[PDB]
Amino acid sequence: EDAELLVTVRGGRLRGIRLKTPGGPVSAFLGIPFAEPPMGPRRFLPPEPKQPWSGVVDATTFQSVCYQYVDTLYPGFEGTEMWNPNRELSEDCLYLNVWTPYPRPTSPTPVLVWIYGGGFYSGASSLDVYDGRFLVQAERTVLVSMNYRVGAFGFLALPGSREAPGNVGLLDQRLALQWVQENVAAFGGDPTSVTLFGESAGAASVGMHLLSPPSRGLFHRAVLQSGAPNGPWATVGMGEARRRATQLAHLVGCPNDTELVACLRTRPAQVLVNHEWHVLPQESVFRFSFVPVVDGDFLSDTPEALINAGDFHGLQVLVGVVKDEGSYFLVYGAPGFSKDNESLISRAEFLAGVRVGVPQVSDLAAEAVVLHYTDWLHPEDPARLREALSDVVGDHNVVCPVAQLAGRLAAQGARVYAYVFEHRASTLSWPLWMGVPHGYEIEFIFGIPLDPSRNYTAEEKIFAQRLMRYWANFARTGDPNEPRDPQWPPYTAGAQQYVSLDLRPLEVRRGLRAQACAFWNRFLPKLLSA
Amino acid sequence: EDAELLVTVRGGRLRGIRLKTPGGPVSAFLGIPFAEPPMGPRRFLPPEPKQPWSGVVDATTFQSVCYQYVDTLYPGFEGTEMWNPNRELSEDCLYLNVWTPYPRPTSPTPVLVWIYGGGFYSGASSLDVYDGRFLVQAERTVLVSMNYRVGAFGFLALPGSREAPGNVGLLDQRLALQWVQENVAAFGGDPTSVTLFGESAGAASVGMHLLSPPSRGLFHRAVLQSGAPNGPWATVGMGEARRRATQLAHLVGCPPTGGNDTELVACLRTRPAQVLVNHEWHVLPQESVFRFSFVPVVDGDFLSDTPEALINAGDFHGLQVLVGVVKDEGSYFLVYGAPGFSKDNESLISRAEFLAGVRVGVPQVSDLAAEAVVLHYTDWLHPEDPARLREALSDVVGDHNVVCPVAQLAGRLAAQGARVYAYVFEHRASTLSWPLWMGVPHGYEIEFIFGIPLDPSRNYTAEEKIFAQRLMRYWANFARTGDPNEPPKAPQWPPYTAGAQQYVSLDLRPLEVRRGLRAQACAFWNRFLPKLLSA
Numbered sequence A: 001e002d003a004e005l006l007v008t009v010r011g012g013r014l015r016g017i018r019l020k021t022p023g024g025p026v027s028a029f030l031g032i033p034f035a036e037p038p039m040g041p042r043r044f045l046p047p048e049p050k051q052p053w054s055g056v057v058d059a060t061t062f063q064s065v066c067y068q069y070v071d072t073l074y075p076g077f078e079g080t081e082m083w084n085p086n087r088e089l090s091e092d093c094l095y096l097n098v099w100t101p102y103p104r105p106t107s108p109t110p111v112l113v114w115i116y117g118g119g120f121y122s123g124a125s126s127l128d129v130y131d132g133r134f135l136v137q138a139e140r141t142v143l144v145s146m147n148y149r150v151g152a153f154g155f156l157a158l159p160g161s162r163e164a165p166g167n168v169g170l171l172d173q174r175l176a177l178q179w180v181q182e183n184v185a186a187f188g189g190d191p192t193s194v195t196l197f198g199e200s201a202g203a204a205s206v207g208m209h210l211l212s213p214p215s216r217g218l219f220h221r222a223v224l225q226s227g228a229p230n231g232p233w234a235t236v237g238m239g240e241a242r243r244r245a246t247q248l249a250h251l252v253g254c255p256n257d258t259e260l261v262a263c264l265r266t267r268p269a270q271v272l273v274n275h276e277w278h279v280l281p282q283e284s285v286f287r288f289s290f291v292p293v294v295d296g297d298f299l300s301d302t303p304e305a306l307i308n309a310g311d312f313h314g315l316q317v318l319v320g321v322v323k324d325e326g327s328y329f330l331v332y333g334a335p336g337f338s339k340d341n342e343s344l345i346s347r348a349e350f351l352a353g354v355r356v357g358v359p360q361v362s363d364l365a366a367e368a369v370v371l372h373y374t375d376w377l378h379p380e381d382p383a384r385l386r387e388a389l390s391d392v393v394g395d396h397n398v399v400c401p402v403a404q405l406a407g408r409l410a411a412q413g414a415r416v417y418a419y420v421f422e423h424r425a426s427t428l429s430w431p432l433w434m435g436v437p438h439g440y441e442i443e444f445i446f447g448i449p450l451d452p453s454r455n456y457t458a459e460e461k462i463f464a465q466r467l468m469r470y471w472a473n474f475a476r477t478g479d480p481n482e483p484r485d486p487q488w489p490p491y492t493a494g495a496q497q498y499v500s501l502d503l504r505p506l507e508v509r510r511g512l513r514a515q516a517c518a519f520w521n522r523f524l525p526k527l528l529s530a
Numbered sequence B: 001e002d003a004e005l006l007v008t009v010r011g012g013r014l015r016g017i018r019l020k021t022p023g024g025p026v027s028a029f030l031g032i033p034f035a036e037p038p039m040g041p042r043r044f045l046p047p048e049p050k051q052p053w054s055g056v057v058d059a060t061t062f063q064s065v066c067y068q069y070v071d072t073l074y075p076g077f078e079g080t081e082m083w084n085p086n087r088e089l090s091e092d093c094l095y096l097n098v099w100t101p102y103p104r105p106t107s108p109t110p111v112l113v114w115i116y117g118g119g120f121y122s123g124a125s126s127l128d129v130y131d132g133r134f135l136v137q138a139e140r141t142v143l144v145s146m147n148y149r150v151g152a153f154g155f156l157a158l159p160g161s162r163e164a165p166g167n168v169g170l171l172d173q174r175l176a177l178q179w180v181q182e183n184v185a186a187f188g189g190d191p192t193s194v195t196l197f198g199e200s201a202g203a204a205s206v207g208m209h210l211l212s213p214p215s216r217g218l219f220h221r222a223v224l225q226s227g228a229p230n231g232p233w234a235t236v237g238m239g240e241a242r243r244r245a246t247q248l249a250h251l252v253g254c255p256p257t258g259g260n261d262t263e264l265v266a267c268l269r270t271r272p273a274q275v276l277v278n279h280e281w282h283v284l285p286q287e288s289v290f291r292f293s294f295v296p297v298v299d300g301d302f303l304s305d306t307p308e309a310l311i312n313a314g315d316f317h318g319l320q321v322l323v324g325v326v327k328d329e330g331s332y333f334l335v336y337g338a339p340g341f342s343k344d345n346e347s348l349i350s351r352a353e354f355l356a357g358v359r360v361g362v363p364q365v366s367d368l369a370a371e372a373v374v375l376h377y378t379d380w381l382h383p384e385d386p387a388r389l390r391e392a393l394s395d396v397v398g399d400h401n402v403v404c405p406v407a408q409l410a411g412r413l414a415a416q417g418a419r420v421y422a423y424v425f426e427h428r429a430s431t432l433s434w435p436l437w438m439g440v441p442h443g444y445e446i447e448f449i450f451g452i453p454l455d456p457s458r459n460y461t462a463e464e465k466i467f468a469q470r471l472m473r474y475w476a477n478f479a480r481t482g483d484p485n486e487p488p489k490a491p492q493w494p495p496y497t498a499g500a501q502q503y504v505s506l507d508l509r510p511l512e513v514r515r516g517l518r519a520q521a522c523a524f525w526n527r528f529l530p531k532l533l534s535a
């Protein structure tokens, strides 16, 4: 019996598994329960702490994936399938995973906590691209990742009601962070050095923990990759959440909040999932049905409001974006777009595309978008129209909300580092026109290129090692920089400096799409208020 | 008596004068009466045709400048005083000038008609920079220029009333054009080949003659230099013209506000000219630059609808137009009110001065509209750089008032039947007295078009004399053929169209073809901003 793979936590005893990497072994504890199964009467409710167990919990394999929609846009295509559930779906899904060096650290080790981010409707800690073994081995941190409820199960809200208060998937995350505070020391982790990192909806999640005081005491540093809590997709108003929840009930044969939720509770999980997309108010891309709601509780105000009012002295943040944030989303509803052609669209498609990529705004607001994103010397060139609509969706949804967050945080006391990730993976299965799409820096951060059975280049492995070092440096010291030899400067509202991350050495540049983001962040809100 | 200097027009006999020019003699008939003097009871009224006369009228020197405000911003400074009256002020000013080759052409010769344009408030055909002798000598055309009423005397309007119907200054221009039709043949001119050209308010005037059917039959081609009838300064609505007229009257004691229109106008008619002028600038709704108190009014008469509407509804087949701007349309205007600006320093302004200047340069729009201007003209990587801010405010004023109105006109005309040629004038005269930061300001292509550098008493470089000859050739070629191109191996000037949007750079180097008249900027002013003002 291997003693390194036996751990006792507050709830009881666990048995882990030894994992191999090209650099040596790692200890892994997978499928550790942190909450009571949120089933039956517990669907839509805040998570309850896992009651203590007797015996030894088998923690050698990933647990079930939280019930969610399965992407069938391109059946059998790696580009979409790598994000789909790779374990059975279940509402009994509140488990987390701990990876630690082998043998276990005998002294307090810095902790990284990963939050996955498929638009709050999808994701799992078990996805191959989130394999913690390489980061933990190379950088000697403790890595934790958790499953949290998504879609209706995590975010359906009838605001004010006790039966479906909203944001429960976020509370799942907070519970797991509490679990980390109380139990990570048993693995060698240092609960006084916990860095949150997340991508997309996971990045929005991290930002939300920053702005919610009960969570703020559970970690120390934050990394937000291609996502921000002030994103136009990341929250929904009380009224619109109530309407979406109400339409879901109607669509599945249910009728008073109590009676409505009770009837929803009798429905099979899959039935809810089958009608998830139908509650959106219009055809769109980069919009999701069930997301965090501003209700006065978890978020006492809108993320924008909470951001502007915040004192962020003592906070270090790492934020950044990929080179082509918008491209991926275009194939899910923008007219003329497909991974299977050049997607060289026409002006008319571009214009219809703008209403899809910027849904629910006035005709005037749309016209303003078209003004800023048209090259009036080349108003009808298909290649430029393709690039421009990608820019619209990417700026509006990701780049500009991240830039706004970064600027406010920097100006209000936080030390901020910003990056643009510009490397297109040699193994990327998406077409060349998509460039470096959303989500495709993650495999480098997790050091997936070090996996021998995969086809990455020697250069790419070295690059992955650089990135793991930046991320782990940040977790350890709040500063990604290595000892001097080209330096990564902090981002500030004025100088707006960030670095490019690719195969070349760090290059320092200015402005996260400053011209475009002035529009989304300064002008467009004024317009919409009148 | 010299037979070349004697001419009989419908109204009676004329005696002219023989002018020396560096390249030979020209006949000039200066100060020909074309209307009865708009004096006393005729103030604010449409012009009456000049009654025939017995004997010989001496047309041998320029007549009076129409009563107007005199620029006192920089007393003594050549850059401003070159535009100031160089004859006595008088309401007796309805005189035109004709220059013809010596000896008088044997066969009918194409005619250029010049219209000056100091914002509808100033200007005169007598200005040194409008001397027609050099054009006529170089290119053997006939040149005509006229004085027309400016300021209140030309454009004060109480819409609806017979006593001050508005647009009488434009009626002055039209009467002169009618005169050209009836009389220019007597000077050897061809009434079937008349090309109008004007700069600033003159350009806008030319545009209005294009959009007003009774004027449209009096000419065949048009040249609009740094102005357009659709500019935000060039017309005013009926209600705003009434408000301005009424406040002027009120400021000078009429009546002893509003009331009977006939009575209010009768009271205004008893006021000395200079009294009206002293209060001209006071009727503007806010502090501004590039805004003028009394301008053409959309009356439903001379202009049946807004120039924008008329341009859009127009069929312009069989029309040739030459349009253009200088390199720095906005700079001249900034020293007349934009905080931080002066000809006497670098005008390196602060961000706060920039924001304030935006409201001066784009007066009377919503805060939201102003915010939109700030958005498009701020460089968000250098939002506070003084030099960039100075240039940005210049571009705001130039784009909003000149470049974008001209581009909109040019695009609509081309798409609706007209052959259009477009230019940007990029030479800064060696003799320019304005500071270097102003670049090539509004109005500074004129001296080259008229061939002023050929004047021996002036100190232009030899290159500039070559340049002037080139421009005079383009202008006259256009007058003659409707096409500025030489009727060889010289680079060609292509038509401007809505799609390719091609134009030429006019400077000391040969023609260079380019695309887009500030296209990104002008999409904001011409396509977006109006949608914002509605909603």
Ligand SMILES: *[C@@H]1O[C@H](CO[C@@H]2O[C@@H](C)[C@@H](O)[C@@H](O)[C@@H]2O)[C@@H](O[C@@H]2O[C@H](CO)[C@@H](O)[C@H](O)[C@H]2NC(C)=O)[C@H](O)[C@H]1NC(C)=O
Binding pocket: A333, A334, A335, A336, A337, A338, A340, A341, A342, A343, A344
């Ligand atoms: C590129 O493809 C899009 C998407 O269409 C799908 O993918 C293609 C590879 C092919 O399998 C199509 O038949 C698929 O429907 C094309 O946009 C569609 O065009 C069809 C007509 O062929 C039209 O009925 C649909 O409405 C369009 N779908 C969308 C997403 O708008 C597009 O024409 C292709 N562009 C090219 C040819 O460059």
Ligand SMILES: *[C@@H]1O[C@H](CO[C@@H]2O[C@@H](C)[C@@H](O)[C@@H](O)[C@@H]2O)[C@@H](O[C@@H]2O[C@H](CO)[C@@H](O)[C@H](O)[C@H]2NC(C)=O)[C@H](O)[C@H]1NC(C)=O
Binding pocket: B337, B338, B339, B340, B341, B342, B344, B345, B346, B347, B348
């Ligand atoms: C540049 O000049 C402007 C205009 O001021 C005038 O011109 C100067 C050359 C100098 O001769 C001044 O005395 C003139 O009054 C300056 O702006 C003015 O600043 C003063 C107070 O300092 C103020 O009373 C005026 O209202 C201002 N005028 C305007 C139109 O803003 C400006 O400060 C000068 N820039 C410099 C020196 O950097």
Ligand SMILES: C/C=C1\[C@H]2C=C(C)C[C@]1(N)c1ccc(=O)[nH]c1C2
Binding pocket: A071, A083, A116, A117, A118, A119, A122, A123, A124, A127, A200, A328, A438, A439
């Ligand atoms: C590019 C693929 C993506 C990214 C964003 C979203 C919103 C959905 C997605 N399929 C997905 C699904 C699950 C997940 O964990 N991350 C992501 C990231």
Ligand SMILES: C/C=C1\[C@H]2C=C(C)C[C@]1(N)c1ccc(=O)[nH]c1C2
Binding pocket: B071, B083, B084, B116, B117, B118, B119, B120, B122, B123, B124, B127, B200, B332, B442, B443
């Ligand atoms: C650059 C100087 C100008 C230009 C525009 C205006 C409006 C006034 C001005 N002083 C002026 C005055 C009289 C005139 O005939 N033209 C002009 C052109």
Ligand SMILES: *[C@@H]1O[C@H](CO)[C@@H](O)[C@H](O)[C@H]1NC(C)=O
Binding pocket: B260, B261, B262, B263
């Ligand atoms: C205005 O006053 C005059 C002066 O007597 C008068 O003749 C005229 O009819 C009046 N017009 C109107 C419309 O009141």
